[PDB]
Design a protein around this ligand. Sequence first.
Ligand SMILES: C/C(=C\COP(=O)(O)OP(=O)(O)O)CO
Ligand SMILES: C/C(=C\COP(=O)(O)OP(=O)(O)O)CO
Lengths: 200, 200, 178, 181
Amino acid sequence: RTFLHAVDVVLDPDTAHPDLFLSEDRRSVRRCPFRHLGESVPDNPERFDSQPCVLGRESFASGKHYWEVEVENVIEWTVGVCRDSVERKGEVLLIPQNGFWTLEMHKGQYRAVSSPDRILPLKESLCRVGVFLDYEAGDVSFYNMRDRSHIYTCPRSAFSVPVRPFFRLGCEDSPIFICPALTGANGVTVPEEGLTLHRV
Amino acid sequence: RTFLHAVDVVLDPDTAHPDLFLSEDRRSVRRCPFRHLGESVPDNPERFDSQPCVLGRESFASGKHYWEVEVENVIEWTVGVCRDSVERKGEVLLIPQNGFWTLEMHKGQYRAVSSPDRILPLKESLCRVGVFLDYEAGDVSFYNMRDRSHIYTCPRSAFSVPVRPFFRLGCEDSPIFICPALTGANGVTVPEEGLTLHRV
Amino acid sequence: ALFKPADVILDPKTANPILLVSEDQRSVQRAKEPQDLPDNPERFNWHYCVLGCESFISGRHYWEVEVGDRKEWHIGVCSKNVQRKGWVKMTPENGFWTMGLTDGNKYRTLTEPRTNLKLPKPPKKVGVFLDYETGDISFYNAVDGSHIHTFLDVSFSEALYPVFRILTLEPTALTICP
Amino acid sequence: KALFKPADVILDPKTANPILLVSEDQRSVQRAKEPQDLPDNPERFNWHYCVLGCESFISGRHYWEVEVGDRKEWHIGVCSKNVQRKGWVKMTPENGFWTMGLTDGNKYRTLTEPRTNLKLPKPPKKVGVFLDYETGDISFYNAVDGSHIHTFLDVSFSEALYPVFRILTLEPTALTICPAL
Ligand SMILES: C/C(=C\COP(=O)(O)OP(=O)(O)O)CO
Ligand SMILES: C/C(=C\COP(=O)(O)OP(=O)(O)O)CO
């Protein structure tokens, strides 16, 4: 249990706000508002009904876990971790006391724990963001994956219940991508001279 | 056994050729030729003596494991995985037959498994390389961590014994850095406002 | 007929968790992600392989496999005692006598080293012939009767199973002609 | 002063976080580079870099003295017998810790909720700790010039209280209990 887990994150379509449009592989998402215009969308209890959010299908109750998100050219996004038990209904505040641990891009600035009083003074545009969980440490940390530099660790919190990958999109037709865990030649013939520059 | 492990690689000083100079934290290494000039160096059966090599202290006998290496401004180097049983005293070809699975930079070219017949047609200078191991798969793979793109997978091999992270420098006073695994705020006070832009 | 036609049924206890064996155990497809099955000793836990239920210990046998226009598949036989846990290279020396298709148009025999095959026509149906005592295994286009490959004079020390392998998620399943 | 019995405080190795090294005499504590291979028995702090005394306080007035020297990082005080020892918990009175100390060489804090920054005119080298069990008081003093550092008047008087010590950093100066004397 001392091992850092490089998570393979796949989005859970049952949590997804109806404006969110998941890829079929469920590793990317964009927001297309009123895309269910003239439709009655079932409002199952797991689904975010006002906040344009979606959870990873994985939940964590212990250990160390991280994943990477590509956010380049997205003007409004949130990433992080939330309790499995967060309120899904209404305009919930995305703050630690409600079981949300986030990093946000809002109006050209980066904000920790979605707070207007915690603007982060980064000197570059984030392109690939690392989301790190250490359950027993009460730790949610964010990294700039260009140089693997620390951005922010949230106030330490007792998670108490399982937590899940959290995502929010606040802009339209601008997709974020969740970086698949590396798999090497998994599922692929390796020629006897090796496999060169594999693409899919 | 299903988890991808993001390894925390620390160099084993007992394996390190005498011309290698390790950082205090043993996460970076440069070559300083004839730095023991006029000295008698003690016998050590773990030490690489024919080529300037050094191993990670970690060994793997199963599972999936990866780590990242910064190689920017080093232009004579070899990284990957080797059997713990490889020849340390005599000079061997750094090829799968001898228990080495490697990506090499040599005379301005990227060579798969240290082979003049396996020039990799890369179109950019590698800065950060991912070394990926899937023990059960016989899989050692290399990634360009700029865009997380596959470079090469070695011909599949029965590792059979425990394997180790492998590093070699063919060049002087230009260091390689082994990227520590992410730790978040491990070992650090997190203020009640969070920890902003932490630097070691 | 010089070879007893074999009645080959896929053994779901041997199938890699990523393979889907049909209700009637005559066809196999790939899932998007491995199912949650036990790692019983008989199961291939790495290669995307499934065995027949019956192994061959003597005599002469054949069976026919519809490959369709599937862009990827390998078939043949293997020994009872092949490594089912972890990758092993599928070669005669590891107990595998197989051939098939990768990447739409590249036919190989899974020899050490692999050999590329020069097939005038792409086969939609393949016939596999085993003669235990001589030590011959042969592959034929089953519609137009052309030869594909033969492994000659092997010294078998073990029961042999029919073996099937698919890597790609495709619409064309792999089906044993009854 | 005379009202406070000098306590004989010895570090309990069974309680120390595996990354701590307790001296053979059980008076001083340093950090290892990396955690040692020790059992995770119920007494041991498995996340916080803490160690307790062997003896807990249940009544009366008690004094001990800690040499912090020029250490850049340390926290001391007491904690309840029943504190959570497994996984992070905030070291605050509500979770049963009454501690203060130093971080980053020159940032003296009381570990309460929320944390506050303490004004020290002199960096202390020796800290005197005065516990009055019945009045739920623990007070911290510069043991050299006798000046006051900080008081809690909200210490439990229903729980056994252990002296507690915490160090995050790897540095030359140990943290050392002055023996009852
Ligand atoms: C990924 C996979 C098998 C590919 O094995 P290899 O990579 O050994 O290739 P082949 O020459 O096709 O046997 C699953 O059975
Ligand atoms: C890493 C660590 C302790 C830091 O705890 P916290 O991050 O809770 O900070 P504080 O108690 O305010 O110093 C090990 O004891």
